[PDB]
Design a protein around this ligand. Structure first.
Ligand code: CLA
Ligand code: CLA
Ligand code: CLA
Ligand code: CLA
Ligand code: CLA
Ligand code: CLA
Ligand code: CLA
Ligand code: CLA
Ligand code: CLA
Ligand SMILES: CC1=C(C/C=C(\C)CCC[C@H](C)CCC[C@H](C)CCCC(C)C)C(=O)c2ccccc2C1=O
Ligand code: SF4
Ligand code: SF4
Ligand code: FES
Lengths: 80, 165, 61, 39, 72, 95, 144, 738
């Protein structure tokens, strides 16, 4: 299972959540940023590490960072 | 002479291969008229060959068993035996023109970095400023050594670094 | 902190414009951990030319 | 006309013409002064 | 799963042959093997060297035997 | 400068905004507190809706042509190019 | 709002049947089913390839992987503004008709959503891997 | 209602945008910040679909583009004629086409390129052209270089006209979409007029100009001795002298007594033996037949009157039971996607050019052409390459369409739809068959060489060993050999000697002979087949899964060209139909290189040489060396390598020069082929540190190429090096040995 992490620079513009094709992300209340919104990954075991989140985070260092881990059938995106 | 290298102004293989060249020439030549453009061209070619060879012999080139010119690389040796005209002056002219071009390049570069449209001057060029810096670029070495004595050439320790340095 | 439009040198190591200078667009007066808003002229490998910063990560230069 | 002048001040055409100029310089050089080896 | 690479169950848990491939690829990166301790790893490389030497001596002795057998 | 009539949840507030200043920046300099987060044209936090007049938001990246054709604007990267009227706090109406 | 259930007796939309269909994995491990009610009857495209026509109201389709249904949700939600609800099913017959199942949709902040996996810090504040050394497995510094 | 629909002064004329890079596109118009800006700017300059969305404006753009293309071609042909008129020995070679080498390019007396102005005969000093302009012009009967002068002049004029045409039709008056869409009108127009008229006018020129002058040529009269063509047109006296049918003029034609005109419409078949060219009577008969055909053809479809046909109607009519909607809606499709018509025409045209080269070497039409073995080989390889590239471009633009213009909503259950359905089974069967082909056809040669090195040639597959005789091809050959007896009673000779028969000799050189087919040729044919099947495989996969896949269900969303979708779920490297056609380029080059090798060797061994018996160039060695790859490499390559590897000091020395240079560049491509743009940008960052260290950074941010762009650069350089190496080798070898 890959690893994904959120950092305080999250401006909550959700593009990550907007980019995850697997809904491995979501937005929650927060108070660190003006958006009062923090990105959140409750379904990491579904992330195939396609990182489109990382592509989407406009944050200087990506408010979010993916780390590929072990391999499950869902991690590999196998439908067979 | 040096390293047992005899001058081809003295060497035998030199004149040998020269004559061989001229022989091949006359051989290709013997298949025409005289006034024929090919004929006259081959004759001019023979002329050029012999002239280049006389020049090479006059140059005092050490040319070994092949009779072919080999060059020497030592300031002291070339000076002591009259062989600076092969490496020394060529290298000096090269370095002159090269430093000239690099210096004027940096000159235009600084001039245009002192602009509000760096990209646009990088694409479209200031013709007259270019010509001006070209005319002025001769004094590039004196200018550079001046700026060195002032230490104004190089950038200080503020350029971007990598995180692990 | 610094003034809007003013020029500051960036010191945040992980920043594209690290060891470089930027222009303070503004600074927030709320409790944001990074109130300094600083534009840039060259774009990053992401193409962005402006980033948020705390007060220390920059210096008026 | 000014549009034309700008089009000529565009970059690749300038690179072009400068290169053409230099190359013709050196070709004529070799024409009138064939076979250079030393000096 | 399979005892695939006992020294790395994480690899032993791949339901593809890549399990096999990486179990090979990492058979000797003990610094990454599971639960490895320092002195243990030291003795590991010790026996590794031992087998290395044994390999060399076998090579040489076989050469010499075969030449003595079938050479001129 | 251009007169920007901001139609806000507090009422209308007409501010002056130079041609070289982003709508959001001018609003803040005038003491208003409009929504924002990224300030880079890459989200919807600062969305408004232009009712009349024109803006230049050419560096924005988040909106599509149909959204802009209906007047939506990312105020953090939008310059006025005429006197204009802009309803603020429009993010919800974009969704 | 409350978690819905699944109704296996839903008229599936109109499609001629493709070859990009389900496999052993469906009968073996699991497979997902998607639930949505269309306002009208209309043709649409199959994520696994093919043109299909949805029926008015209750329409149902099943798939193995999650990304199929997710892309399909994107297509309908952005092209027809439907709010489908798709589940997770296993050969046991147990459903979990869950893939964005969470009251509303995650693209908006919502009360109750507790943050997870969120390093309440910067990213540059991580420690050198020399310290994660001699752990029970390969562990990244950012793991902590 | 078909008519003319145009728009006046649509586009203005100013050098304003000329000063504006990227103006055509949205983003590029913003100007460069990093270096890829220029690259993409160039890349998208002619993507008019990317430019905008107006079908009509895009049509006008491509219309003017074609205009300019034609103008370029005019320029080139005219310059060719110009240099033929001014720097050639064509009149000398007219006096003697048997011992003067066609040469039209002379170089300048400079540092040493002058040595290349070798001796080609007639006191001429230049370079032997392998184009065959000489035989072309002789067949057309051009005599005075003044004629070529006039020709080049008129070509200049034509090019200027075409370019003005493009300008006018783009900026002054640009037609309208419906006008562009009056498709049946365009078909009738072209089909009848263009082809029929061109062929018929060529036949008239033939009859009244070339056949008389070429007749006198083969009669042996001096070239500068024949009367002028227009003088011939004036004096029907001499035309009746040559053929008395002309004494009666044209009234016999108006009395349907064609039999009398047989003097110039023959059906001999075969070549003129004293010339090696086809029988010009037969050529004119061919062309007039083609003319009548296309003329009657051009009146098929309705345009503005009740009679005609409807493409749409007939296509809808044609539907079968197993097929559902049959051929419905395709009318709509073709009326709408430029890339569709494009890819169609490209595939067709590549196939054509291939067939062209085939028949051309099969039955050479030009005077003494067959003797010019080099010209034969050269034009053949040329057109083969051109055709293959046209094929792959077809595949490219087809996939392009399928990405861009595709829409399911209009194609419900059509041929396309069921294809999309059962594509998996299709491609599966294709994989299996290609694998079988490769296995068998390759292992044949390999087992041969294996038994060879094993000293068991008894167990090889040779025409002497275990045989595979193409009984089919040989039976068909004899079939064509015997056809004229009954299946063609009015025939005199078979169209080709390779059907069987005798040998034709012009000047000792082997002009043409019947060719047999051995197990070697069996094997090489099967090789070719397997390779082509691989190529069609990769192309078909690319096009079928361009929009989606069980791996990527949304592939249509990533644009046509795109690097990958990450390393996630294993790694998405090289997953575009763009990448697929890339691979196809590779496999195609492989295929055609093999084919030209086969052609060259078999020619040299069993066809070409000099008559006395046949002094075959390689003495038919191919027959027994081709079964084994060792024989291949040594006896073909290693042997014929001498010419190129000792060509130095000769006028042909440049052949070995470019040989080594092509080696060089072909290897140069491989750094791209293997490297990584990430690594590259890392190096970029290092070097920009180095520069800024001296305040010498460039404004435009230096950037490593896109993955795609690196792929493209590499593949271009690779194919360039390979083709050039082979080209040089062939040229030197044949100029030396032929
Ligand atoms: C790139 C390195 C290099 C090398 C390998 C050589 C090689 C040589 N040099 Mg030196 N030399 C060089 C660069 C070099 N030089 C440069 C750049 C200069 C310009 C200042 C000189 C100036 C120079 C002179 C004026 C003389 C030599 C001489 C020689 C030759 C014998 C002395 C010796 O071994 O010097 C070893 C080389 C070096 C120590 C490299 C550094 C050179 C410094 C700057 C000057 C060296 C002068 C040398 C010690 C003089 C020895 C004279 C000898 C009769 C005792 C020998 C072929 C002598 C000669 O011609 O002998 C036949 C001689 O008279 N060189
Ligand atoms: C010197 C004469 C001239 C001038 C000033 C222009 C001016 C223009 N042409 Mg060009 N154009 C001309 C001759 C000229 N064209 C010719 C001879 C042709 C025929 C091949 C074309 C075909 C042509 C096309 C097809 C297009 C332009 C386009 C343009 C525009 C941008 C040019 C960069 C501009 C209106 C572009 C344009 O108008 O885009 C909207 C465009 O698409 N021109
Ligand atoms: C399109 C084909 C073409 C090509 C490939 C060449 C090639 C060449 N031309 Mg050019 N040339 C051509 C057409 C062509 N020309 C035409 C159409 C013109 C009219 C502008 C000329 C007019 C021309 C002249 C007047 C001369 C050349 C010459 C040359 C040579 C040096 C440049 C070179 C072999 C030079 C040459 O042939 O020197 C021997 C030379 O003097 N060309
Ligand atoms: C680097 C030296 C050099 C230079 C300055 C030139 C210069 C020229 N070459 Mg080139 N040429 C050179 C080396 C050079 N050539 C070499 C190494 C080759 C071998 C590939 C050739 C082969 C060559 C040919 C075959 C021809 C030229 C021609 C020309 C002339 C027209 C362009 C021009 C004066 C053309 C010429 O002379 O036209 C009349 C021409 O036809 N060159
Ligand atoms: C397509 C080109 C073409 C052209 C421009 C001409 C031109 C001419 N033909 Mg015609 N002609 C042509 C094709 C052509 N012909 C064809 C295809 C045939 C075969 C049916 C003939 C057969 C033919 C005959 C038999 C005669 C002409 C004649 C003529 C001349 C008087 C009219 C004139 C020079 C008359 C003439 O004066 O010929 C010299 C004449 O008697 N032509
Ligand atoms: C032999 C003479 C001849 C005759 C009797 C016809 C007869 C006809 N032509 Mg015409 N046509 C002919 C030759 C002929 N054409 C030739 C040589 C050309 C010039 C290339 C054309 C090009 C042409 C076009 C482009 C069209 C016709 C069309 C027609 C039809 C309606 C008018 C009609 C049946 C119309 C039609 O629908 O034809 C099928 C039409 O649009 N013709
Ligand atoms: C008739 C000739 C022709 C024309 C008009 C075009 C036209 C185009 N090609 Mg090209 N193309 C062609 C032949 C042609 N191509 C051939 C023979 C190949 C095989 C090498 C390709 C392969 C090809 C690719 C792979 C791509 C283009 C692209 C393009 C577009 C940008 C220029 C444009 C639609 C680019 C594009 O964006 O196409 C839509 C692109 O990526 N072409
Ligand atoms: C796909 C083509 C092909 C075919 C039809 C054959 C046919 C044959 N091979 Mg095989 N063979 C092939 C490829 C092929 N081989 C290849 C690629 C190699 C290289 C490894 C060999 C190496 C090989 C050997 C060494 C031998 C055969 C033998 C044989 C025989 C079958 C047992 C028969 C003559 C046997 C033989 O000699 O039978 C007479 C045998 O001993 N083959
Ligand atoms: C498996 C597919 C395949 C393919 C694509 C081809 C392709 C071809 N075969 Mg066939 N052929 C094959 C396998 C195949 N063959 C096999 C396995 C056999 C043995 C039964 C033959 C026996 C055979 C003969 C005897 C002949 C061909 C010939 C041909 C050519 C025309 C048909 C063409 C190159 C003809 C040809 O041109 O041979 C050189 C021919 O005469 N083939
Ligand atoms: C070498 C290499 C590079 C580095 C090389 C690059 C980016 C090409 C550089 C092209 C030229 C040399 C730079 C542009 C020069 C400007 C026009 C400045 C003016 C120069 C004058 C001489 C005209 C890659 O970026 C790359 C990326 C992906 C796969 C393979 C490779 C690859 O092999
Ligand atoms: S790694 Fe892939 S699945 Fe995970 S958030 Fe990023 S894009 Fe979505
Ligand atoms: S990762 Fe970036 S895009 Fe996603 S919520 Fe955080 S700041 Fe917004
Ligand atoms: S605050 Fe994100 S686009 Fe304006």
């Amino acid at each position: 299972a890959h690893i994904v992490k959120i950092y305080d620079t999250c401006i909550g513009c959700t593009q990550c959540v907007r980019a995850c094709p697997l809904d491995v992300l979501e937005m929650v209340p927060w108070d660190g940023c003006k958006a009062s919104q923090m990105a959140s990954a409750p379904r990491t075991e579904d992330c195939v590490g396609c990182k489109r989140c990382e592509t989407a985070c406009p944050t200087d260092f990506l408010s979010v960072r993916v780390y590929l881990g072990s391999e499950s059938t869902r991690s590999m995106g196998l439908s067979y | 002479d040096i390293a047992g290298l005899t001058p081809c102004s003295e060497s035998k293989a030199y004149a040998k291969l020269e004559k061989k060249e001229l022989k091949t020439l006359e051989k290709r030549l013997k298949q025409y008229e005289a006034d024929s453009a090919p004929a006259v061209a081959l004759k001019a070619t023979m002329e050029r060959t012999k002239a280049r060879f006389a020049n090479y012999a006059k140059a005092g080139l050490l040319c070994g068993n092949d009779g072919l010119p080999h060059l020497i690389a030592d300031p002291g040796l070339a000076l002591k035996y009259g062989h600076a005209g092969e490496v020394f002056i060529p290298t000096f002219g090269f370095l002159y023109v090269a430093g000239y071009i690099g210096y004027v390049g940096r000159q235009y570069l600084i001039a245009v970095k002192g602009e509000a449209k760096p990209t646009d001057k990088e694409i479209i060029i200031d013709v007259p400023l270019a010509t001006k810096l070209a005319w002025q670029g001769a004094g590039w070495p004196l200018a550079a050594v001046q700026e060195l004595q002032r230490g104004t050439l190089l950038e200080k320790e503020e350029n971007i670094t990598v995180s692990p340095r | 902190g610094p003034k809007r439009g003013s020029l500051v040198k960036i010191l945040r190591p992980e920043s594209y414009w690290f060891n470089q200078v930027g222009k303070v667009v503004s600074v927030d007066q709320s409790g944001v951990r990074y109130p300094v808003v600083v534009r840039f002229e060259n774009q990053n490998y992401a193409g962005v030319t402006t980033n948020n910063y705390a007060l220390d990560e920059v210096v008026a230069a | 006309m000014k549009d034309f002048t700008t089009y000529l001040s565009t970059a690749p055409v300038i690179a072009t013409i400068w290169f053409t100029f230099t190359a013709g310089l050196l070709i004529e050089i070799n024409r009138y002064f064939p076979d250079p080896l030393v000096f | 799963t399979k005892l695939f690479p006992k020294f790395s169950q994480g690899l032993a848990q791949d339901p593809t042959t890549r399990r096999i491939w990486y179990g090979l690829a990492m058979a000797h990166d003990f610094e990454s093997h599971d639960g490895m301790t320092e002195e243990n790893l030291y003795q590991k490389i010790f026996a590794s060297h031992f087998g290395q030497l044994s390999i060399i001596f076998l090579w040489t002795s076989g050469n010499l035997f075969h030449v003595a057998w079938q050479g001129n | 400068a251009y007169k920007v009539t901001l139609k806000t949840p507090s009422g209308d507030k007409t501010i002056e905004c130079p041609a070289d200043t982003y709508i959001l920046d001018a609003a803040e300099e005038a003491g208003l507190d409009l929504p924002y987060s990224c300030r880079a044209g890459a989200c919807s936090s600062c969305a408004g809706k232009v009712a009349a007049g024109t803006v230049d938001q050419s560096d924005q990246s988040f909106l599509d042509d149909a959204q802009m054709g209906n007047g939506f604007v990312l105020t953090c990267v939008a310059y006025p190019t005429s006197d204009c009227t802009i309803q603020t706090h429009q993010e919800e109406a974009l969704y | 709002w409350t978690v819905p259930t699944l109704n296996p007796d839903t008229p599936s939309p109109i499609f001629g049947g493709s070859t990009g269909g389900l496999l052993r994995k469906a009968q073996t491990e699991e497979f997902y089913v998607i639930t949505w009610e269309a306002k009208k009857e209309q043709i649409f495209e199959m994520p696994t390839g093919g043109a299909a026509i949805m029926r008015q109201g209750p329409n149902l389709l099943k798939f193995g992987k999650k990304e199929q249904c997710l892309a399909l949700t994107t297509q309908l939600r952005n092209k027809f503004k439907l709010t489908p609800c798709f589940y997770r099913v296993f050969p046991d017959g147990k459903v979990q008709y869950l893939h964005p199942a969470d009251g509303v949709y995650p693209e908006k902040v919502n009360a109750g959503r507790v943050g997870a996996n969120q390093n309440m810090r910067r990213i540059g504040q991580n420690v050198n891997p020399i310290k994660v050394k001699f752990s029970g497995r390969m562990m990244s510094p950012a793991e902590i | 209602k078909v008519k003319i629909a145009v728009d006046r002064n649509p586009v203005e004329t100013s050098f304003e945008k000329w000063a504006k890079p990227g103006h055509f596109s949205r983003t590029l118009s913003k100007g460069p910040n990093t270096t890829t800006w220029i690259w993409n700017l160039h890349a998208d300059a002619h993507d008019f679909d990317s430019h905008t969305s107006d079908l009509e404006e895009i049509s006008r753009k491509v219309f003017s583009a074609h205009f300019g293309q034609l103008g370029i071609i005019f320029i080139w042909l005219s310059g060719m004629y110009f240099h033929g008129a001014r720097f050639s020995n064509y009149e000398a070679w007219l006096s003697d086409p048997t011992h003067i080498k066609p040469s039209a390019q002379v170089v300048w007396p400079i540092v040493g390129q002058e040595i290349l102005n070798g001796d080609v005969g007639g006191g001429f000093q230049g370079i032997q052209i392998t184009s065959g302009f000489f035989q072309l012009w002789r067949a057309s009967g051009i005599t005075s270089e003044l004629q070529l002068y006039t020709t080049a002049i008129g070509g200049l004029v034509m090019a200027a006209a075409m370019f003005f045409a493009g300008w006018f039709h783009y900026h002054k008056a640009a037609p309208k979409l419906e006008w562009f869409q009056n498709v049946e009108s365009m078909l009738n127009h072209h089909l009848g007029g263009l082809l029929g008229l061109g062929s018929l006018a060529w036949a008239g020129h033939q009859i009244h100009v070339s056949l008389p002058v070429n007749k006198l040529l083969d009669a042996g009269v001096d070239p500068k001795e024949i009367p002028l063509p227009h003088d011939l047109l004036l004096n029907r006296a001499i035309m009746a002298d040559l053929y008395p049918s002309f004494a009666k003029g044209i009234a016999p034609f108006f009395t349907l007594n064609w039999s009398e005109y047989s003097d110039f419409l023959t059906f001999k078949g075969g070549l003129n033996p004293v010339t090696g060219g086809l029988w010009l009577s037969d050529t004119a008969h061919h062309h007039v037949a083609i003319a009548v055909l296309f003329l009657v053809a051009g009146h098929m479809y309705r345009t503005n009157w009740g009679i005609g046909h409807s493409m749409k109607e007939i296509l809808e009519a044609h539907r079968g039971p197993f097929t559902g909607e049959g051929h419905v809606g395709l009318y709509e499709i073709l009326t709408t996607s430029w890339h569709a018509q494009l890819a169609i025409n490209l595939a067709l045209f590549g196939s054509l050019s291939i067939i062209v080269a085939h028949h051309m070497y099969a039955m050479p039409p030009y005077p003494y052409l067959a003797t010019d073995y080099g010209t034969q080989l050269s034009l053949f390889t040329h057109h083969t390459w051109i055709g293959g590239f046209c094929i792959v471009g077809a595949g490219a633009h087809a996939a392009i369409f399928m990405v861009r213009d595709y829409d399911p909503t209009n194609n419900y259950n059509n041929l396309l739809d069921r294809v999309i359905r059962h594509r998996d089974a299709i491609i599966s069967h294709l994989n299996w068959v290609c694998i079988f082909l490769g296995f068998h056809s390759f292992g044949l040669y390999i087992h041969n060489d294996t038994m060879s090195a094993l000293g068991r040639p008894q167990d090889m597959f040779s025409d002497t060993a275990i045989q595979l005789q193409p009984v089919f091809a040989q039976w068909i050959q004899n079939t064509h050999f015997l056809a004229p007896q009954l299946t063609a009673p009015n025939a005199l000779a078979a169209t080709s000697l390779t059907w069987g028969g005798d040998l034709v000799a012009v000047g000792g050189k082997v002009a043409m002979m019947p060719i047999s087919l051995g197990t070697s040729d069996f094997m090489v044919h099967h090789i070719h087949a397997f390779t082509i099947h691989v190529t069609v495989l990769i192309l078909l996969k690319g096009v079928l899964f361009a929009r989606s896949s069980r791996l990527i269900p949304d592939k249509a969303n990533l644009g046509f060209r795109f690097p990958c979708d990450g390393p996630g779920r294993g790694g998405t490297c090289q997953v575009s139909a763009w990448d697929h056609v890339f691979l196809g380029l590779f496999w195609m080059y492989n295929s055609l290189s093999i084919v030209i090798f086969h052609f060259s060797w078999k020619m040299q061994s069993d066809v070409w040489g000099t008559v006395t018996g046949v002094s075959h160039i390689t003495g038919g060695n191919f027959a027994q060396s081709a079964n084994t790859i060792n024989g291949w490499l040594r006896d073909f390559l290693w042997a014929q390598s001498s010419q190129v590897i000792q060509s130095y000091g000769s006028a042909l020395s440049a052949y070995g020069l470019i040989f080594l240079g092509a080696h060089f560049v072909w290897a140069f491509s491989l750094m791209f082929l293997f490297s990584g743009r990430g690594y590259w940008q890392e190096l970029i960052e290092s070097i920009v540190w180095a520069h800024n260290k001296l305040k010498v950074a460039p404004a435009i941010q230096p950037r490593a190429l896109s993955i795609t762009q690196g792929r493209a650069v590499g593949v271009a350089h690779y194919l360039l090096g390979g083709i050039a190496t082979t080209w040089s080798f062939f040229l030197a070898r044949i100029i030396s040995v032929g």
